[PDB]
Every structure is written in C-alpha cells, then in structure tokens.
Amino acid sequence: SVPSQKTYQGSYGFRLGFLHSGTAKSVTCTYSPALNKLFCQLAKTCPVQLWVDSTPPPGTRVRAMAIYKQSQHMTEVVRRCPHHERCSDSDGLAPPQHLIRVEGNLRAEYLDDRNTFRHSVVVPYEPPEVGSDCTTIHYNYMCYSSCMGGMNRRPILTIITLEDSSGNLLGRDSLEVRVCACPGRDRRTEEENLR
Template sequence: MESQEFTSSFPSSGFLSPDLRDVLLDGVDPQIFQILDQSQGYESVYPKVEDALQNEENTMPLTENFHFPSDVSPQFHPLKASKLLSNEEYEGPYDFDVFIVPNPKSKNPWVYSPFLNKVFMDMNQAFPVEFRVRKRPETPLYVRITPQYAQQQSANEPVCRCINHEHYADPTNKEIPEHVRQHVIRSQNPHAQYLGNSNENERLSIILPLDKPQVGNETTTELFLFVCKSTCSSPGMNRRAVEVIFTLEDHQSQIVGRKCIKVRICSCPKRDKEKEEKEQMNGTGPPKGKKRKVEHPIQSGKVLPMGEDTNMYTIKLNLTGKQNVLKVLDRAEELYLANAYKLRGSPEEDLMRRNVAEIQAEKRRLM
C-alpha cells in the first residue's frame, strides 16, 4: 500500500487522539494500532505525528518515521571471550554465503587465496567482502564480524590492537571514538555498530545491517580494513593466526548462518600468499586451527559431489596482450589450487596438481 502524504499544521496536544488517527491513517493496517495499544503509549513507540507535520513546508509520508516497539527491535550484545565461537560453516535457512575476489594483481594491497581460504592484506587498506542471501525473509537481517584466534590455546582471548596502534595519537585514530580504537577490524558502513570491550574480556565485533542487493546483483558488498598487523606485539596479534567469523543474525541476535575466512595483515600480501601456498602444498606449513563445532547440532547444507569429470580438455584461444594471458593463467591456477585442496587425499588431487604445474610452467615461459 502506498503511503499517503499530508501537509498540515497541528497544535501541540500530546498523543494523537484515536479520532484524528482514524482520519489521517485511514486504510493503514490495523495491526499497527494493536501494537500501539499494547505499549505504554504512542509517544514511547514513535515520535508524535503532530510534531512531524508542524512544518507546513515539510511534506512526508506519515509512515516515514514509524519505529518498531522495543520487543521487536534489534537486540545485540557483546560476546564473552571465554566462550569459544564455532567456525563451522553453516548456510542456514537463508542460504548465506560470503565471497572474496581472488584479485591476483601484484601491486594490489590485498589478495585472496581460495586454496588457503585466506585473505592477505596491507594494514589500513580497504578490501571488499560480498554477502549473499538467496532466501531473504521479510524481517531485517544483520551480519556480525568477529575476529578470533585460530589456535585453540589463544581462542579464548579477544583479538585487539597493539599498544602503539591503539594510542590516540596514531594516524589511524584521527577523529575515531575511543571505544572503536580497540577494534582490529573497521567497517566503512556508516551504520556499523562496534560492540565489546577487551578490558572486560569481551570479544570485539561489528554489527552491520545487511542491505538488499542493488538491482541486477545477487550480492551486497561491504568494505573493511584492518588497523593492526599480524606481527604487532602483545596485546596485539603477535604472529598468532587469526580468522574472521561472519555470522548472519536476525533482529533477536539468533544465528541463522555462518562463514569463516582466515586473514593475515602484512606488508607484502602477494609474496606471503605465494609462500604459504607453497608451504602448504609441500606439507611444511604451520598447523591449522581445528574446526570448532557448535554446542547444539545444526543441519548442514548439502555437499555437492566433486571430481566426477576427470576428462582432459585442450582448448586454443587467441588472446591479445601478454598481461591478459598471465591474468587468465593466474585465475586458472587459483581454481586448480582450490580444487586440489578440496580433493586432498583422493586420486583427483594428483590431476589437479599436475594442472597447476603445467600452468606454472606456461607462466614461466611467458615471463
């Protein structure tokens, strides 16, 4: 139903009377008034309608400033660091997913490795994260972003900044509120809420409203940045592995989806990415953090069958420009590395690694 617009001037007379309400809001869903009648008065639920209409030059829909009563308003609270967060991925009832573009450019301040499911980025540089919800409900959805140490021995400590970077005189803290300075992650969304206090042993997290995608898009993009490095001394990350847990939550802070991505904040993202991928392929990489299951069982999404098509295909393409050819090979290498990791321990893994070796040989030849 379209909102009706009115331009009028009313004296200040307290709450909107039922008679006047019926005249102005004829046709509005009566359930709104049932909610109001159960509350402690109209003024406690939303601003006076008379005040919204006092300015004769202001023409606006009457429903513009309506707010939900407190019992259905978003309720989010800091998480205690002593309670370990699950990092088991869970698509949930709304088919929640998180995407990061590999971005293999050498001079880019961030790069993603599908093989490691890890983002490598420079400090204080924005990187995009795409969120997808295929079955969106009528009620609002929110995303909570929480960093957590990947190793079990450190997982019950809040991930916070080092003393130097948290200091008010640090350039990254210019015009930043004091309660935000502790946070390792920042969002460029103006509606972001920063929760938690490391001094009270609370996890530091960010809450964002998950907007609907723009027309023609399936995902919503948000920009984040890290304002401390992985090598910063305690109470900073101090070379400890960190993962970021994205939880999809409803207005009652119930988790209805979860994704997890590892991160490393460093000065040379592409170099560190290639080094860790090589170490992982050779079996010399650092030990991985264990998956922590949720306290209550959840119904996981279906796993698609992999490795069914093992046929070899030969294609011939005429591509213009050596740099374009290298980009195509970079993308192919990323895909096969990711497949080799997912198929580890199976016969198909060897096929994927042979493909990777051939692609790398072709890249060396072109360089």
C-alpha cells in the same frame, strides 16, 4: 568461552564470496581459496561479498569478529596492539581498540561484549541493488598480524555471522586472515608451501 566457527548456510543459504585480485607484488588485498585465507595490507579495503539464496527478513544484520586460530590462544580477545590502539586514527565511530572496522557505512555499530569482552562490528544486511547479485561489505584490519603486544604473529580467523534482529544465529562463515606488508608475496609463498 569461544565463538563457534562452524560453517552454517542456514535457511537463507548464506555464504561469503571474494574478488579475484591476483598475487602481484603490488596487490593490497587478495584471497586464497586453497588456504581459505585473506591476505591484506594494514587498513586497506577488504571487499567481502555476502551471498544468499533467498532474502532474509528486514532487520537482519551481519557481524564480523576475530578470534585466534590456534586453540591455545582462542580464549584471548583479539584486539589492536599497544601502539595502534593509541594512534588516534579512529574514523569517529570505531573504538580505537577494535581490529576490524567497516568502511563507509554510517549504520555500523561496534560492540564490546559486556560478558566476553570480545569486539565485533555489525551492520544491517542490505539486499543486493539493481544489477547486482550480491551485497558487499568493505572491511579494514587495523593491526598487522606481526604487531608486538597484539596479535604477535599469531594467525587469526574472522567469523562472519548473519543474525536476526535479536542477535540469533541465521548463518555463519569464516576465513583465516593475515595482515601483512606484501599480501601477494605471502599468498604465493603460503600456497607454494601447501603444494
């Protein structure tokens, strides 16, 4: 099977938002609206905003999962490569095999689906704080898109779903992600190629 990637705002008007970081050669994370693609360095903070028109119920959660973008690779579980899964860089909560981690949230839970074998990380949805209009989750990608034996240069999509306490779908959004050495340069090159 393959997780759905269909955009769905749902009853709460759920959608993602990204900061405007630019494309300076030194940038560590940058999002391209034209390509709906996030470019980031290995294990660097990727701020992802959660926007809703109305607050969902207490117990609502937010899950992140990666899948290969190419249809011929969609059924393959996206996981860290043979080298990174063994580098003992766990933060004490994320299994070393997981590509996507959530930073600074002790309530993050990591799932290895007993049926699909796919990996995901989920946190409780927290409503915006005083003075804020949105909620931000900080993600880290733990392998480069080019890692051999892992993503192996194949592009991936990250699917973010808003779920109820039972795991039922409330909202869904997604974006392509490239983990690379120079996000600014690659974003500039890909947007140029699109033009």
